[model samples]
Target: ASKRALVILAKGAEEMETVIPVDVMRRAGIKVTVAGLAGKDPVQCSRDVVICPDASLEDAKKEGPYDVVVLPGGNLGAQNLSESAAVKEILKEQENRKGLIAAICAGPTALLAHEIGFGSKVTTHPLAKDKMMNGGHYTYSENRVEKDGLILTSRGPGTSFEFALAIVEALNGKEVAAQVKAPLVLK
Candidate 1:
């Protein structure tokens, strides 16, 4: 069975972070579901890139325990994710199951919102550091990608590919991750 990923697509989500992971994960042969936060409709990303989701959160929740749950950040998108009871429950369940929870930039702040992965060393966009560190719940790291057991995080748009590749590595393996990375022509 192929590994699966759940990417929560919210209005104002960072398009780079959203698309890069979905594309790379697919390249790694992982089944990825891009779920809309609101009802089934196109989401307006942070940079105005509109994306139609695979399903609405209500519908996607039924798909069940994916190998990973991804959160791509824009301040507003993270805020929207932070506010959703649906997102809260999903993250909580994913955490309970010890599944991978990946977040990027401001996306990790939503982890703080749901109170998930409190003791891990995490990273976020410099601009989002204050919010993610609100109560010193997590150790801060400046690494391009930081994986603390199940919770994996990365910095910003410039680091999105690294972040996506890390997810691929986690779900698959080093060989698969390197095989997928070769075609990307990164330095």
Candidate 2:
């Protein structure tokens, strides 16, 4: 079976962050589920883009054992994810199974919210640093993409390609990641 990814989308999510990873993952041949936090309707993004989700989170999650769970960030979007009990359970299960859990920018804050992957080296958008570091539960880094074991995180939309490629490398392989990266003209 192809590797599967679950991307949770909420109102105010960074459209670039959500779409970049989803698109790149699809290019790497992963089956991605873009699930809406507010049901399967269209989502209004942080930059005012409208995204139609593939499924409602509640419904899509039932089809898992996904290879990865991705969280995209906008302050309010991350807040919505942080407040979700459904997200908490999904994250906990992913951690328990040692599956990849990837987040970017303020998205890492939701990891803090669920108390997941403490002790992993993680990074977030500079504005989100204080929140992720509040309890000092995890080591912080400024790397564009930091993958410490099962937890994968990145700084911001600027690093979305690196973040997505890192995820492809983790689930697929370095060769696959390189093959996928070339046509994108990424350095």
Candidate 3:
């Protein structure tokens, strides 16, 4: 059976972080669902790129237990996610289930906010380090992409491809990730 991913999209999300993983995961034959945090309307990203989600998070939650749950970053987007009880529920459930939870840039701060992945080694955008480390709940890493068990994290836009490919390697395999990476002509 194919692996499934649930990408939670919020207003002010980083477009690159959101799209890169969604696109790459699809290339790896993983079923990807872009679900809006607010509703089924088009979300305006931090860069003003608008993307329509496949379903509302409310509707998507009913289809539980995805293989992975992805979080894309933007300061405001992460803030929105951090403040959401719904998001908290999802992250908590995913954590309890020991499913993969991938986040990038400021997105990792939402993990901090929701108290998920405590004690995992995590990395976030350089500017977001202070926020993510506020309580010393997680060990910090400077690596462009960091994955300690089920919680995976990465830095910023420049690291989006590495982050997405890491998710592919986890869900599919390194061979599949390499196959998908070759066509992108990545160095």
Candidate 4:
């Protein structure tokens, strides 16, 4: 079966983080469905990058159905995403299995706002820590990534590539992830 992913899209989505993972994973041959929040058209990114959705989230049939969920960080996208009843329902249901939940930069705050990171060790944009119980230890990289159990997070825009690799590691296993990472020469 295909390892499925439902990548939510909305106005003001983080350009790099949102696009990178999908690009990388698709390059690795994973099935990625770009589930947009509104209608299918160009969604604005944090920095004004225009991204078109493959399908609307409501229309996106999550038929693991999915193995991982990714949340990219942009203030508006994060707010819009976590507020979705469907997003919450998915999180609540998938919190129990091999399915992973992840966010990056301010995106982690979205997971927190939706109550996904309450007791989990996580990392995000430095400014957001004050708003949540981010028990994760500080590290020297805005370009590094972290994972605990099935939850993955990265620091910020700088961490986008590492974040994608981390997700690759989680879904595709260490050997494949390493082979994927080998060309990038990432640490």
Candidate 5:
């Protein structure tokens, strides 16, 4: 069985947050489908950076039994994703399977909005943490990634490398994760 993850990227996604994990996973032999919220087109992140899509939500809706689902944090991306019912349902299913649901920065809050972050040990960009407001315990760490059952989180920006390494950890085990992390001078 292929280990598939649905990465829902929105117009305002943090460019680094959105791509790092997906790239890292692909290198580590994981199958990731970049699910765009606004059909198939370039989705801008930050202010002007744009990323192309691998598929749309409509196209990914048929991608089933995914092993993981992730939401990358960015100011506008979180807001856009939070408003989409399809995104909400996908995260809910991540909770249902107890499969990993990873998020960075504001992306974590989007999951909380759906009650998916409740009782899970979550992390986010410091600024984004404010939006989570309730549900779950927040830990401030430099370690890399925090896994709270179905949820995986990390501090923002600087921690993105660890965040990606952790996904490698989740999919391939600690040994492979360590091996993957060894060559990096990840910032």
Candidate 6:
């Protein structure tokens, strides 16, 4: 069976963080679903780039138990995700099932807001460190990508490709990740 990834899309999300993983994961043959937090309409990203999601989050949830759940970050995007009751439910369920939960940049802040993956080592965008460390629930790291057990995290846009490749490695394998990486000519 192929691994599946659910990428939650919301208004104000960082377009690079949102698109990178979805594109890279697809390259690794993972079924990636870009689900809109609102409805199926196009979402305006943090930089104002518009993207149409494959499905509404509500509809996506029905296809559940994905292999991984991805969170993309923009300050307001993470805030929007953090304030969502549905998001809270999804993360909690994914955690309870011991599935992989990946977040990047300010995305980890939503994990904190929903109280998921406490005590795991995580890394967020440098500017988002204080918010993610509010209670010191998880130890912090400065790695471009950090995967402590099922909770994977990374820094900002500069590290998004690494973050997505990490997810590909976790779901697929190092060889597949390498194969996918080769074509990109990443330095």
Clash totals for all models, in order?
A: 0, 0, 0, 0, 1, 0
Candidate 2 on 32-106: residue-level lDDT in tens? 999999899999999999999999999998999999999999999999999999999999999999999999999
Q: What is each predicted model's overall lDDT from 0 to 1?
A: 0.96, 0.96, 0.96, 0.75, 0.79, 0.97
Predicted candidate 1 versus true structure: per-residue lDDT over 1-187, tens digit per residue: 9999999999999999999999999999999999999978999999899999999989989989899999999999999999999999999999999999999999999999999999999999999999999999999999999999999999999999999999999999999999999999998
**Candidate 5 Cα errors over 4 Å, as ranges:** 135-144
Per-residue C-alpha lDDT of model 4 across residues 27-76, encoded as one tens digit per residue: 66679988887767789888998998888777774563678878888878
Off by over 4 Å in 6: none
Candidate 5 local Cα displacement, residue 54, angstroms: 0.5
Query: Considering summed lDDT, which 10 consecutive residues are worst modelled in model 3?
Result: 178-187
Q: List ranges where model 3 is wrong by over 4 Å.
A: none
Root-mean-square deviation of candidate 3: 0.6
Residue-level lDDT tens digits of model 3 in 117-149: 999999999999999999799999999999999
Report the lDDT of model 4 for residue 73: 85
lDDT of 1 at 100: 99
Over the stretch 14-124, how does candidate 6's per-residue lDDT look in tens digits?
999999999999999999999999979999999999999999999999999999999999999999999999999999999999999999999999999999999999999
RMSD of 4: 3.1
Candidate 6: RMSD over Cα atoms? 0.5
Q: How well does model 5 score by local distance difference test?
A: 0.79
TM-score of every candidate? 0.99, 0.99, 0.99, 0.87, 0.91, 0.99
Tell me the lDDT of model 4 at 187: 60
lDDT winner between 4 and 5, please give it. Answer: 5
**CA deviation > 4 Å runs, candidate 2:** none
Error of 6 at 114 (Å): 0.5
